[PDB]
């Protein structure tokens, strides 16, 4: 059954990034997906994505750019306090310079470089670099 | 059959013929005489070979010469074999032959309403 519905947009972006596609058709559009790509959109790792609506679940057609390498998804959502947030930024993020760990804190989905500013902690969602 | 020709008789037969086909004869006995001129040899049975092989192929260049040789006289004839034969053109002058579905492509693309007629 379709277990993790965040996850296989990120294995359809990453899979279709590698072959170098320019547009990507996700299915079926969580509002955690759109909150995730908007985090990937403020940093320009993604185009402007359009949500072709059904009355079923939603479908997204995403425009790809070609700036990113890997969007993954940390299943299960491990509970990540602020103190062990640094543990993950060594692991998932390939340099201290760039890269992002998206996590759901309670004050809205933000990456670690916002939640380490707003002093929030939450559960982890995914990453990208 | 069983008297094949080695490399030296083969690799010298070309290099004298494409150079000195001119003022060269078919007569092997005088083709025996010309090998001491246009090259050198240490021994006379090699001139029994290297003249014998060129004369065992000398008539063969008249009748459909094989590859690997440039006689320097057929290529200047090949300029005339680069002949334009007049006057091959559009055959039925348009041509009127069309596949009857790309006649649309002769109209949807081309503004030429010229006579390309349906042949099924």
């Amino acid at each position: 059954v379709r277990m993790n519905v965040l996850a296989d947009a990120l294995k359809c972006i990453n899979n279709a990034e590698k072959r170098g596609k320019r547009q990507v058709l996700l299915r079926p559009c969580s509002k955690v997906i759109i909150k995730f790509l908007t985090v990937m959109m403020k940093h320009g790792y993604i185009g402007e994505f359009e949500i072709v609506d059904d009355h079923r679940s939603g479908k997204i057609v995403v425009n790809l750019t070609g700036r990113l390498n890997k969007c993954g998804v940390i299943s299960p959502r491990f509970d990540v306090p602020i103190n062990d947030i640094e543990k993950w930024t060594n692991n998932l993020l390939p340099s201290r310079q760039f890269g992002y760990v998206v996590l759901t804190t309670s004050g809205g989905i933000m990456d670690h470089e916002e939640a380490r500013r707003k002093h929030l902690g939450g559960k982890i969602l995914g990453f990208f670099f | 059959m069983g008297r094949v020709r080695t490399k030296t008789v083969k690799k010298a037969a070309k290099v004298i013929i494409e150079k000195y086909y001119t003022r060269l004869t078919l007569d092997f006995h005088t083709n025996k005489r010309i090998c001491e001129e246009v090259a050198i040899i240490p021994t006379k049975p090699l001139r029994n070979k290297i003249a014998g092989y060129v004369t065992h192929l000398m008539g063969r260049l008249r009748h459909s010469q094989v590859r690997g040789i440039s006689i320097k006289l057929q290529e200047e004839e090949r300029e005339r074999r680069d002949n334009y034969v007049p006057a091959v053109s559009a055959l039925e002058q348009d041509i009127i032959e069309v596949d009857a579905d790309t006649k649309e492509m002769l109209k949807l693309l081309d503004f030429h309403n010229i006579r390309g007629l349906q042949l099924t």
């Binding site: 940093h43 320009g44 700036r67 390498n69 390939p94 340099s95 201290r96 310079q97 760039f98 | -």
Partner: protein, 227 residues
């Protein structure tokens, strides 16, 4: 003493002997075929040291009875930002290493050295993390702060002391006794560092001179201009 000035064979090395290219990374800029080591004797050669890593013998079973030929490794690296790797088999150990040092020079590639966490003062280690696999060994290069030197096995520490990478973290899986697959694994990891689209490289270039365009006259002339 040269004692023999190299002949321009290709059109590329024509230009470096005629001096129309005076920068080594120009051929790296368009990814040219660098197929004469007499190219890199011009640009570098000052500060290019050879180290061998193994002179691993290797044998074949003929009918009476064996025959040994020598797969000598050699490793050249300009001490800041260029590295190479050389492997060849021959009947003598001298005619491997006199010719292995050729085969390392032909594959000399540029290193990207990046700041670990704070961009101050001539970046040192590596911009990202890179794995190079060559047959079941895969060395996983990782940045480190200033002043902690190259921690590895002693072999690819020699691949990085001569690469200009200053302070690196490494970890190597697999049969790490096979030296061919442990040199080449790091070589295919060091050379990777300029093939990874860090977000620093998004604004593009004017995108080209392509020096066969920029110098189409000297290759149009057949006269071998000297100097």
């Amino acid at each position: 003493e040269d004692s023999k000035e190299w002949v321009p064979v290709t059109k590329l090395g024509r230009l470096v002997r005629e001096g129309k290219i005076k920068s080594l990374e120009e051929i790296y800029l368009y990814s040219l075929p660098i197929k004469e080591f007499e190219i890199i004797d011009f640009f570098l050669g000052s500060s290019l040291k050879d180290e061998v890593l193994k002179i691993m013998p290797v044998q074949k079973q003929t009918r009476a009875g064996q025959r040994t030929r020598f797969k000598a490794f050699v490793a050249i690296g300009d001490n800041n930002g260029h590295i190479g790797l050389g492997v060849k088999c021959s009947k003598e150990v001298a005619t491997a290493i006199r010719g292995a040092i050729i085969l390392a020079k032909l594959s000399v590639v540029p290193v990207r050295r990046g700041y670990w966490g704070n961009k101050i003062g001539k970046p040192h280690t590596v911009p990202c993390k890179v794995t190079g696999k060559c047959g079941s060994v895969s060395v996983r290069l990782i940045p480190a702060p200033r002043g902690t030197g190259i921690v590895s096995a002693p072999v690819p520490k020699k691949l990085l002391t001569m690469a200009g990478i200053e302070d690196c973290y490494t970890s190597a899986r697999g049969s790490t006794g096979t030296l061919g697959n442990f040199a080449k694994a790091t070589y295919a990891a060091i050379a990777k560092t300029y093939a990874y689209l860090t977000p620093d490289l998004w604004k593009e270039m004017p995108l080209g001179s392509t020096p066969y365009q920029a110098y189409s006259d000297f290759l149009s002339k057949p006269t071998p201009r000297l100097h």
